[PDB]
Structures are given as C-alpha cells and as structure tokens.
Amino acid sequence: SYVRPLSVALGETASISCGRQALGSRAVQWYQHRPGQAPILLIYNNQDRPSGIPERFSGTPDINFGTRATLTISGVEAGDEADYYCHMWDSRSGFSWSFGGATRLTVLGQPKAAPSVTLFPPSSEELQANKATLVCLISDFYPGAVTVAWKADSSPVKAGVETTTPSKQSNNKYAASSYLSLTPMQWKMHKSYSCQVTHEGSTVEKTVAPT
Amino acid sequence: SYVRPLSVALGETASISCGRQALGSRAVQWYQHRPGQAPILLIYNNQDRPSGIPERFSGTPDINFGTRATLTISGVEAGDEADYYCHMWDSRSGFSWSFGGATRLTVLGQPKAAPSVTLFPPSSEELQANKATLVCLISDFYPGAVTVAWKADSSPVKAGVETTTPSKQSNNKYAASSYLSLTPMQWKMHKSYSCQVTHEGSTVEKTVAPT
Amino acid sequence: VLTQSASVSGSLGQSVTISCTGPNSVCCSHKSISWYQWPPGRAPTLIIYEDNERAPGISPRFSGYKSYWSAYLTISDLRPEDETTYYCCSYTHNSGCVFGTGTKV
Amino acid sequence: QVQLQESGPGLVKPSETLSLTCTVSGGSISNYYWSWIRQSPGKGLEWIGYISDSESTNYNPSLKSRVIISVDTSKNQLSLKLNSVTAADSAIYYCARAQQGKRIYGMVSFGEFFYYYYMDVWGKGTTVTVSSASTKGPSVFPLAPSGTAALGCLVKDYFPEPVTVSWNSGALTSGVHTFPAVLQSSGLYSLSSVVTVPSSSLGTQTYICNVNHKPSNTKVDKKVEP
Numbered sequence: 001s002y003v004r005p006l007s008v009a010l011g012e013t014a015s016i017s018c019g020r021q022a023l024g025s026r027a028v029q030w031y032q033h034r035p036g037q038a039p040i041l042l043i044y045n046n047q048d049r050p051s052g053i054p055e056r057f058s059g060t061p062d063i064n065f066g067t068r069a070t071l072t073i074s075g076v077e078a079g080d081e082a083d084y085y086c087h088m089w090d091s092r093s094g095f096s097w098s099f100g101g102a103t104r105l106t107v108l109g110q111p112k113a114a115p116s117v118t119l120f121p122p123s124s125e126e127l128q129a130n131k132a133t134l135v136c137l138i139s140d141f142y143p144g145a146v147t148v149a150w151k152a153d154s155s156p157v158k159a160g161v162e163t164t165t166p167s168k169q170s171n172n173k174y175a176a177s178s179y180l181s182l183t184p185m186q187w188k189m190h191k192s193y194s195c196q197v198t199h200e201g202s203t204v205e206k207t208v209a210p211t
Numbered sequence: 212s213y214v215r216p217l218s219v220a221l222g223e224t225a226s227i228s229c230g231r232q233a234l235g236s237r238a239v240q241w242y243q244h245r246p247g248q249a250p251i252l253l254i255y256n257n258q259d260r261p262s263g264i265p266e267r268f269s270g271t272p273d274i275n276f277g278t279r280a281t282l283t284i285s286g287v288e289a290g291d292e293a294d295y296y297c298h299m300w301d302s303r304s305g306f307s308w309s310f311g312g313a314t315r316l317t318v319l320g321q322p323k324a325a326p327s328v329t330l331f332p333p334s335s336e337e338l339q340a341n342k343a344t345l346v347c348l349i350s351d352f353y354p355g356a357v358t359v360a361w362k363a364d365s366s367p368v369k370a371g372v373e374t375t376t377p378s379k380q381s382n383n384k385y386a387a388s389s390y391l392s393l394t395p396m397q398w399k400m401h402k403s404y405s406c407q408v409t410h411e412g413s414t415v416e417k418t419v420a421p422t
Numbered sequence: 423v424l425t426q427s428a429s430v431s432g433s434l435g436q437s438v439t440i441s442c443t444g445p446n447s448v449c450c451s452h453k454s455i456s457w458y459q460w461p462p463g464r465a466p467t468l469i470i471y472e473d474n475e476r477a478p479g480i481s482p483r484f485s486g487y488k489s490y491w492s493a494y495l496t497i498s499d500l501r502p503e504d505e506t507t508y509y510c511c512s513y514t515h516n517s518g519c520v521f522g523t524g525t526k527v
Numbered sequence: 528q529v530q531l532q533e534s535g536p537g538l539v540k541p542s543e544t545l546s547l548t549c550t551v552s553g554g555s556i557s558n559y560y561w562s563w564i565r566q567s568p569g570k571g572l573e574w575i576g577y578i579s580d581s582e583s584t585n586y587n588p589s590l591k592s593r594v595i596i597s598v599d600t601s602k603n604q605l606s607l608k609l610n611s612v613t614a615a616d617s618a619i620y621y622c623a624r625a626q627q628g629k630r631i632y633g634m635v636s637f638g639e640f641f642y643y644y645y646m647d648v649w650g651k652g653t654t655v656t657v658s659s660a661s662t663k664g665p666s667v668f669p670l671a672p673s674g675t676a677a678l679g680c681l682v683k684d685y686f687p688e689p690v691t692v693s694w695n696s697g698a699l700t701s702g703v704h705t706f707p708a709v710l711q712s713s714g715l716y717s718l719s720s721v722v723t724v725p726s727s728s729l730g731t732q733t734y735i736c737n738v739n740h741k742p743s744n745t746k747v748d749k750k751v752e753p
Contacts, residue, residue: 154365155403202324202413212571236632249649300643310572491661
C-alpha cells in the first residue's frame with residue numbers, strides 16, 4: 001500500500017494522525033515496523049501499551065466520538081525512524097484485514113557522520129579461480145547518501161561495478177558496499193585501483209595495488 | 212566611490228548609518244543596489260517607503276535636529292546582501308549629485324552549501340573545428356569561494372585554464388565556471404581529464420575521457 | 423577596404439606599431455596577413471607573412487601580431503633605413519593579395 | 528503599471544557620440560521627471576542628469592560639458608547622447624522615473640525650502656562597452672548529456688557582453704542555469720548554459736538552445752542529442 005512521509009526534528013514531539021477515521025466506537029492498534037525486521041506492537045487498545053515500551057509513546061483514548069486517532073511520540077530520537085501503521089477497528093465497518101497505509105517518520109537534525117572506507121584487493125584464492133573482485137566497504141556515515149567511483153590508475157572505470165543502496169546500521173548510521181569485477185589480467189596489467197567515496201560535499205579515496 | 216563594509220548575523224537587525232551627516236533639515240533616500248541589477252528605492256522621504264517593500268525596512272524621520280540618518284533592516288536574511296546608498300539632501304548644502312558612499316552588507320551565519328560540479332567533454336562539432344575545450348560548471352555552493360584544478364590523467368595542468376569569480380545565484384548561493392582549452396590532439400593523446408573543485412575544506416572531483 | 427594607420431614615427435632605439443584592419447571582407451581571423459617594406463617607386467621587400475613569420479633575412483626586431491579584428495607590425499630598435507612606406511596585405515592560400523592603404527614611417 | 532526599457536549600441540568607438548533611448552510603458556512621458564544613471568565597475572552609482580515634465584534639463588557638473596538629454600513625446604521615448612566617450616565611460620546605464628519632493632523647513636514665503644529628486648521605478652540596464660575593438664558574433668557548440676542528467680550549450684568567443692540564452696525558444700524554463708562569461712586573453716567572452724532535465728526526457732524531447740548577441744545581430748540555434 002501507499003506510504004505518506006513525515007519529518008520531525010530531533011527531540012520534538014511527533015503527531016502521527018491515523019490514515020482512516022473511525023465511523024463509530026473504535027479500537028486502534030499502533031505498530032512500529034522497520035523493513036526487514038519484526039513489527040513492534042506499540043499500543044494495542046486505544047491507549048493501552050504493552051510492557052517494554054516507553055511512556056513517550058502514547059495514544060488517544062475513545063472518550064467522546066469525534067476525536068481522531070493520533071499516535072504521539074514525545075522526544076523523538078534517531079531510533080524512532082520506522083514505518084508506523086494504524087490498525088483501525090470500529091463498530092461500523094467490517095473486519096480490519098488491511099493494516100492501512102504507512103507513515104515513514106524520518107527524524108531531522110541528526111549529526112553528520114563521515115564514512116569509514118575500507119578496500120580489499122582480490123584474494124589469492126580468487127585469483128587462482130581466474131576471477132578478480134575488488135570490494136569497497138563504506139560504513140558509519142550519515143546522511144545515508146554516498147557516491148562511489150572506481151579508477152584504474154588515473155582513468156575512470158564504470159564497466160563492471162555494483163553498488164548497494166545505503167542500509168541503516170544498528171547505531172542509526174548507514175553502510176553500503178561497492179564491488180568492482182575484473183579479469184585477473186586487468187588486476188595485474190594496471191598499476192593501482194582506487195575507490196573514491198564522495199559523501200555530502202567531501203570525497204574520500206582508498207586505493208590498492210598488486211604488491 | 213569608496214565602499215565601507217558591514218557584517219550582520221542572520222536574523223539580527225541591521226543598523227546602517229549614513230555616510231554624510233546633515234547640516235540642516237534633511238530629506239534622505241535609501242536605495243538597495245546589487246551590482247549588475249536595477250537599484251531598488253527602499254525609502255524616499257526621511258521615513259516614507261513605497262509599496263512592495265516590507266515593514267522591516269525603516270528609516271529615521273527628521274523630528275529634532277541632531278538625529279543621524281540610519282537605515283534599519285530588522286530580521287536580516289541572505290537576500291539582504293547588497294549595496295545600500297544614502298542619497299542625502301539638506302537645506303544647507305547644495306544639489307545632491309553624488310549618491311554617496313556604499314555600505315556592503317554581508318549576512319553572516321548562512322548555511323554551508325556544497326557544489327554541484329558538472330564536466331562536459333569537447334563537443335564533436337568543436338573537435339571538427341580543430342579546437343577542444345573542457346568546461347567545468349560549479350553551482351549551488353556557499354560560501355562563494357572555490358578552487359579549480361585540472362589534471363591531464365594524473366599530472367596537473369595549468370597552461371590554458373580560465374576561471375570565473377563566484378557570482379550569486381537567485382537562490383542566494385554562488386556559481387562559477389572553469390574552461391580548459393587544449394588542441395584536439397591533446398584531448399585524444401591523454402587517457403582522462405579531471406576537474407578537481409575544492410570548496411571550504413573538501414575537494415570534489417569530476418572526470419571525463421574520450422570514449 | 424583594408425585601412426592602415428594614417429602615419430606615425432619614433433626615434434632611434436624606440437619602436438613603432440603599425441595597424442591594419444577592415445570588415446569581414448578582408449579581415450582577419452580567416453585570412454593571413456603579410457607586411458611589405460616598400461620604398462616609393464623601388465624594389466619592395468617581404469618583411470613578414472602568415473601573421474608573424476619573418477622572411478629569410480629580416481631583422482629580429484620586425485615582429486607581427488594578429489588580433490581577431492586587426493593585424494599589427496612592430497618595428498623595434500629603429501634605424502635610419504626605416505624611413506619607408508609600409509603596406510599590409512590580406513590573403514588566403516588560393517586567392518589574391520588585397521593590399522593595404524599605406525603608412526609613412 | 529509603469530515600466531521602463533533601455534536600448535543601446537553595446538559597443539561605441541573611443542571619441543564618438545554614444546546614444547541611448549528608453550521606452551516608458553503604461554504612463555506618459557511629458558508629465559514626469561526622468562533620470563539617467565550609470566554604474567561603472569568598481570565605482571559606485573553615478574547620477575548623470577535628469578529632465579522635467581516641462582522638458583527642462585539639468586546635468587551633473589561631473590559630465591556637464593558633454594551630455595545632452597532629450598525626449599520625444601510622440602510616444603514615450605526619451606534619449607541620451609554623450610560624446611567624447613573614453614574607456615572609463617563603459618558602464619550599465621539605467622533609466623528611472625524621478626519624483627519631485629518639496630522639503631519645507633521654514634516659511635515658503637521666504638523660500639525656506641528645497642527640492643529633492645528620487646527614482647521610484649527603474650529600467651533594467653543596457654550594457655555599453657567603449658573599446659577600439661570590433662564586434663564579433665559567438666560560436667555556439669552543443670554539450671550532449673550522458674536520477675537525472677544535464678545538457679549544455681557552449682557559447683564561446685564573442686564581444687562584447689551580453690548574450691541572452693533561452694531554451695526551446697523560451698519554453699523550457701525550469702532547471703535552467705546560465706553562467707557568467709569569461710574574458711579570455713584573446714579579448715573575447717565565453718559563456719555556457721545548462722539545464723537539468725529528467726533522464727527519460729532524452730528520447731526525444733527536442734532541446735533547442737537559443738542564443739542572441741545583439742551587438743552583431745547574430746542570433747543562432749542548436750539542438751542537443753547523445
């Protein structure tokens with residue numbers, strides 16, 4: 001289903017209104033889902049929250065009809081970046097099969113982090129297999145948006161490169177990989193190979209050569 | 212005529228005192244001029260301002276003699292960077308022919324912006340004309356102070372390069388160009404050509420090769 | 423149509439700067455410029471051709487320079503025999519020599 | 528309601544009568560005051576002169592000896608003539624409507640007042656260069672491109688400033704970026720214009736670069752394609 005974004009500054013309080021409004025008495029569930037991971041039920045009744053969930057996550061009860069279901073995250077941190085779902089039940093409508101839309105909370109104001117580039121030459125066992133691959137490992141950067149560039153000696157190289165889109169690490173930073181593939185003769189017939197990693201306005205370089 | 216500078220932090224109120232003080236009852240005009248553009252009359256009487264000018268631009272009236280003419284810009288923004296002139300008239304002195312000196316307001320505290328380098332190889336039609344020119348286009352950076360560097364493959368190149376001093380874009384950022392000129396044989400006889408653009412403490416590189 | 427300087431002079435040791443220009447008909451970025459030393463009613467002499475290449479034997483003080491709109495001929499370190507009338511010319515490889523007006527020095 | 532537009536030669540030889548005109552659109556001409564203002568590089572603004580609604584003139588003593596200001600009420604055109612021009616005369620000449628204000632401090636009967644003039648609506652400026660050099664049209668070469676990409680238009684070797692650049696005869700306006708010129712040692716400016724367009728638009732939204740250089744009446748065009 002579709003996704004609607006939301007940007008909350010770091011430390012602020014987040015107001016995530018529900019996708020569909022209730023026609024009668026309601027019972028709404030709030031799940032926190034970061035893709036590739038198990039969802040986390042934040043609030044199950046209209047305001048009841050399970051154990052292992054901080055008090056900063058709060059929901060609006062159903063006192064008088066008319067009040068909209070809004071999940072409220074006070075004191076937003078970088079870990080709060082996830083998809084939030086509004087499982088809406090009411091007396092009027094039918095069975096709530098669809099989980100609804102998705103709010104993609106992206107917390108602004110996080111500190112700028114520089115990469116930690118690490119380049120590996122082709123292994124001896126790989127060269128023995130008549131295949132040669134360079135890997136360029138990038139980690140611990142923010143915001144998750146980088147650019148890789150491979151250079152045979154000085155001239156650029158673009159045929160045979162593969163790059164991962166950034167992925168969030170456990171410490172709320174990002175990481176990605178860059179694989180250059182070449183024949184073992186191209187590894188020997190050139191002087192050096194470089195991996196230039198440009199993040200934000202700066203570019204870092206790490207190089208390697210067959211020695 | 213001479214120019215006297217003034218630095219006001221972003222968001223503050225600016226106090227621009229007039230160049231020449233009035234010997235009698237005065238009638239002062241305030242113009243905003245950014246070079247290469249039409250001046251903008253901010254205040255025509257001692258305090259009367261025309262339409263299309265915000266209330267944050269204010270001038271001191273002539274109530275009692277002794278008060279100095281000071282243009283006051285409250286809530287300074289990046290767009291307020293310009294030359295401000297004090298067209299001074301009074302009962303004592305003669306006809307105000309000279310517009311006076313110039314106050315160069317430079318608003319501090321603006322966000323740091325990274326370049327958007329874009330390099331173009333020589334066109335086919337240019338190479339057909341036995342002339343070959345590389346252009347390196349830099350845009351959307353702040354502060355307006357960059358450094359270009361051209362490298363034939365790895366070695367540097369300095370003979371035949373021309374660079375523009377930064378110029379303010381409409382979005383309050385800067386932009387400049389760098390033209391490397393070479394014979395079409397020098398374009399073919401080398402492997403690659405690079406344009407390294409160093410802004411603030413970081414350097415970005417964009418390269419191109421005849422393929 | 424190729425106008426030279428009206429006239430000029432200098433002194434022994436100094437230099438001269440003759441000029442030569444015209445419209446897009448005979449000048450200049452797509453033409454070559456030649457400079458002839460020409461005493462009135464006598465055997466002329468080729469000084470400079472191809473907008474700065476001296477003839478075999480011309481003194482290294484004679485020099486040529488061509489802008490995108492006008493051609494020049496400098497005559498450094500003057501000497502007595504420099505009192506002649508000079509003429510420029512604009513030509514291509516397969517055409518004629520359209521001469522210049524004249525310059526008494 | 529009232530706008531002004533300048534128009535000039537762009538290049539005038541040394542020691543020659545420079546001539547400019549300025550058109551008023553919206554209001555009349557013989558009912559207001561008008562001012563000529565030029566701005567040289569480095570030097571600040573300079574008040575040249577002004578003309579009344581009754582077509583009376585008054586020149587700055589700076590250039591009083593050689594400036595003549597005129598007006599044609601048939602339409603809304605007023606001209607300016609400056610002879611014996613030198614290199615220091617090249618500038619952007621502006622055109623604005625002067626408003627007469629009467630500052631009264633004492634008694635009007637004793638003449639204890641004075642008149643001040645202020646420009647409330649200006650033109651845009653006409654670039655004027657004084658140089659012995661001859662004009663030359665540019666040479667426009669395409670710059671082919673390769674989330675999005677960008678293509679260009681290399682306008683090289685012209686004289687003098689300026690050169691207007693539009694894309695698709697004025698249609699393409701978003702993402703356009705025209706860059707200031709470069710005075711090569713040869714004495715000619717070189718410009719470059721670039722637009723950022725979506726990648727998929729390459730096939731085949733025609734991108735026509737338009738270039739005009741009035742000092743040589745040499746308008747040109749060129750397309751760009753990989």
